[PDB]
Amino acid sequence: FGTRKNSFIYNISKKFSAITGTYSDATKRTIFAHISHSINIIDTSIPVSL
Amino acid sequence: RSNVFAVDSQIPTLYMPQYISLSGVMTNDNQAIASFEIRDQYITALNHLVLSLELPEVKGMGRFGYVPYVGYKCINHVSISSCNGVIWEIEGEELYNNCINNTIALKHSGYSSELNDISIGLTPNDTIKEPSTVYVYIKTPFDVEDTFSSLKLSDSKITVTVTFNPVSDIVIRDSSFDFETFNKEFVYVPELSFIGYMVKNVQIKPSFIEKPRRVIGQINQPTATVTEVHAATSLSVYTKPYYGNTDNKFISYPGYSQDEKDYIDAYVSRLLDDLVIVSDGPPTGYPESAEIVEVPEDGIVSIQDADVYVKIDNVPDNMSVYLHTNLLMFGTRKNSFIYNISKKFSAITGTYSDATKRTIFAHISHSINIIDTSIPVSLWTSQRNVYNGDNRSAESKAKDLFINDPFIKGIDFKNKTDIISRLEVRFGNDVLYSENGPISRIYNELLTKSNNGTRTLTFNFTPKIFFRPTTITANVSRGKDKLSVRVVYSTMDVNHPIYYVQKQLVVVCNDLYKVSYDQGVSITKIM
Amino acid sequence: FGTRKNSFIYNISKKFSAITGTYSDATKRTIFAHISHSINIIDTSIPVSL
């Protein structure tokens, strides 16, 4: 999200710092293990249309 | 105007409390009986009885734990009596129901992982449990208003008698544990304590007390009569399962973890190690009646109408995955509806472990309810089942537990399924109350703030102690002096095994008595 | 001025929009004519050590 093309940006992917896990070849998808993040309740409470 | 910022402090009666501990005399079908004599001219009153018990060291092999709330689950009967007769008494189930909303009391009665985890011993000298002490708070009617309601001893001798249940009731064990030796050498060791009051110039007046009275109906009857009802404060109805026609074996028990999800996850954990087997060639060690089918490369196995999705990770190249498709099955006619536990699963995923040669399960999708966890093993292999029935391994058959827990209600361990669909109470010939939904249970739980209420008609709403309780009064002249209860049991499907568990109807009537103190302690029946 | 390496920046040269003028070859310097800007008193009131 941003209002002018080169100012501050709210980016949800910058709130992750470490992502580890194991891939599963039986179901063709990734099973994620331990995550470290700083997500708060507001990000989960933002409506999709905004 | 009334002053709300001050009050005149009343000087109370001069007194001095003291904690008093006594030792008991044990006496001895073969049920243990402990008798305690309280005799000292300086104790004027008492309340707040606590019973302590030393549980001994348990050694040997096998799996062994204690039931939750051992201390309360041990007591069959309590009686307080003087020379004029019984003053008060209660059954263990009414005591437990009265103390079920007290979390502090349940915590002191023994609820921890040290006691309730299912431990394993590997050599005949392995110590399974360390010695510990449990405390049973014996809640009485003398506790409502502290000193105001305490039992006065008008210079008489008071005797307390605790009758114990046999030790088979409070122990959960498998077949490899030497129960007859443990039972031959186990000994109950009780001690009683109470709070006494030394009062100078006490002034005693008569009070009112309630004695619960129990009546048990015949097996499978939907009726039960309570005679000699002259002043009842309430009426309660519930059902107990009766396991006398079985061996009391169950597949699983969660131990310390007591959520309904924990019951279900322990049941699934016991079934899954037998459900999906990784083997080189058709698996061996099962009865001939087992229909074990290889899972195709696509990963979907269709069992009649049910579709099972099986994906196991890290399976070696020289081995295959097999699915047990009729682990437990029950039916009453050869080509009708079938209750099949294999069809209650829809997705099974996990990873193979080459170190332990077993499957570690990941995500499970199921529809298991508490009834499946609550079916005794004997009912799968009864004579009315037209199939073989149990295609489990003998290694799995050796982990079943004996459970004789005496205070089970409903037809599952959590009292979640409501099997009473209609209730009708008659007083004489006229219908006093009738209901379809559980509105009386909703009222019992709102008014007592419990999570395990029963169907209760309450007649008393006046404040305790300071007022005489309100009662429903008999009109023996018009013949209205008995309480009949009649239920209709909810219809179940004739192919569900739970249709054949036997049920008993339990009615509890709280009778009103008057306590008087003219030459010693005495009680009279209100008429 | 900035506090983290890729966030909002206060930049004084972004507050100019048009600059016209005439160069002078006699004094070897530029004589600036009309300027359009949005400078306020605070920029002129910021101490150099900040």
Q: Which two tokens stand for residue B131?
A: 């010695």
Pair B413, B259: CB distance under 8 Å: no
Calculate how close chain A gets to B294, using CA atoms only, in Å: 17
Burial B369-381 (b: 16+ CB within 10 A, else e): ebbbbbbbbebbe
> Could you count the other beta carbons within 10 Å of the beta carbon of residue A49?
4
Q: What angle do CA B375, B379, B385 make, to 5 degrees?
A: 130
Helix (H/G/I), strand (E/B), else coil: B524:
strand
Q: Which two tokens stand for residue B138?
A: 């014996």
> Residue C11: its chain A contacts at CB < 8 A?
none
Residue A26 to residue B362, Cβ atoms within 8 A: no
Calculate how close chain A gets to B312, using CA atoms only, in Å: 7
Pair B428, B480: CB distance under 8 Å: yes
> Residue A7: its chain C contacts at CB < 8 A?
8
Resolution of the experimental model, in Å, one decimal: 3.9
> Residue C8: its chain A contacts at CB < 8 A?
7-8
Pair B310, B276: CB distance under 8 Å: yes
Count A/C contacts: CB-CB distance under 8 Å.
Answer: 3
Residue B362 to residue A31, Cβ atoms within 8 A: yes
In sequence order, what E strands does B273-380 have?
276-279, 292-294, 300-303, 306-313, 320-324, 329-330, 339-340, 345-353, 358-366
Residue A24 to residue B312, Cβ atoms within 8 A: no
Task: Give the C-alpha separation, B2 to B226, whole Å.
Answer: 50
Which amino acid is residue B413, in one-letter code?
Answer: F
Count A/B contacts: CB-CB distance under 8 Å.
Answer: 12
> Residue A25: its chain B contacts at CB < 8 A?
313
Pair B17, B195: CB distance under 8 Å: yes
**CA distances for B112 relative to B71, B99, B117, angstroms:** 13, 18, 8
Dihedral pair phi/psi, residue B138, rounded to 5°:
-95, 90
> Residue C4: its chain A contacts at CB < 8 A?
none
Dihedral pair phi/psi, residue B195, rounded to 5°:
-95, 115
User: According to DSSP H, which parts of A1-50 are helical?
Assistant: 41-44
| C40: CB partners within 8 A, 6+ apart | none
**CA distances for A19 relative to A15, A24, A37, B362, angstroms:** 11, 16, 9, 20
Q: What is the DSSP letter of B143?
A: G
Instruction: Pick the residue from chain A with its C-alpha nearest to C5.
Output: A8
Calculate how close chain B gets to A35, using CA atoms only, in Å: 18
Q: What is the DSSP letter of A43?
A: H
Task: Give the C-alpha separation, C20 to B274, whole Å.
Answer: 87
> Residue B351: its chain A contacts at CB < 8 A?
24
> Residue C7: its chain A contacts at CB < 8 A?
8
Task: Give the C-alpha separation, B329 to B458, whole Å.
Answer: 44
In sequence order, what E strands does B108-218 have?
119-121, 127-129, 132-138, 151-152, 158-164, 171-173, 190-199, 207-216
Instruction: Pick the residue from chain A with its C-alpha nearest to C6.
Output: A8
Calculate how close chain A gets to C7, using CA atoms only, in Å: 5
Do chain B and A touch: 3 or more Cβ pairs under 8 angstroms?
yes
Helix (H) or strand (E) holding B98: helix B92-98
Residue by residue, DSSP assigns B5-68 as S--PPPPPPPEEEEEEEEE-EEE-----EEEEEE--TT--EEEEEEEEEEEPPEESSEEEEE-T
Residue B349 to residue A26, Cβ atoms within 8 A: yes
**CA distances for B217 relative to B236, B240, B242, B503, angstroms:** 13, 11, 12, 10
Calculate how close chain B gets to A20, using CA atoms only, in Å: 17
**Which of B426, B433, B492 has its CA nearest to residue B225?**
B426
Instruction: Pick the residue from chain C with its C-alpha nearest to A7.
Output: C8
- The strands making up B420-427's β-sheet, listed across from edge to edge, are B223-226, B483-489, B420-427, B430-435
**CA distances for B508 relative to B102, B311, B428, angstroms:** 21, 53, 18
Which amino acid is residue B231, in one-letter code?
Answer: A
